[PDB]
Amino acid sequence: DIQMWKVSLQKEQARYNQLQEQRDTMVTKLHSQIRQLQHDREEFYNQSQ
Amino acid sequence: ELQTKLEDCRNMIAELRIELKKANNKVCHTELLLSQVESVQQQ
């Protein structure tokens, strides 16, 4: 059972570590939404103002 | 953008050109003036 809890912690830590890829993915999604928001606002100025 | 470009189109394409034609009308009536241009009542 000690071996079991160790393997179990290993597996749940791997599940929680996949959220590192999730963090990078959401950072990429932010770097899309925010960056396009900034580009849209700057061109909104540069033309519509 | 829609409102800005549409109203700028209205101004520059309708209003500005109509005002140029109205300046032509100005010189027309000014020409009218420039071409259109004693005490017997007492006695």
User: Rounded to whole angstroms, how far apart are CA atoms B9 and A45?
Assistant: 19
Phi, psi of B40 (to 5 degrees): -55, -20
Count CB-CB contacts under 10 A for residue B21. Answer: 10
Which stretches of chain B are DSSP H helices?
2-9, 16-36
Interface of B with A (CB under 8 A): 1, 4
Q: Residue B12 is encoded by which pair of tokens?
A: 């520059």
B1 to chain A, closest Cα gap in Å: 5
Method: cryo-EM
A32 to chain B, closest Cα gap in Å: 23
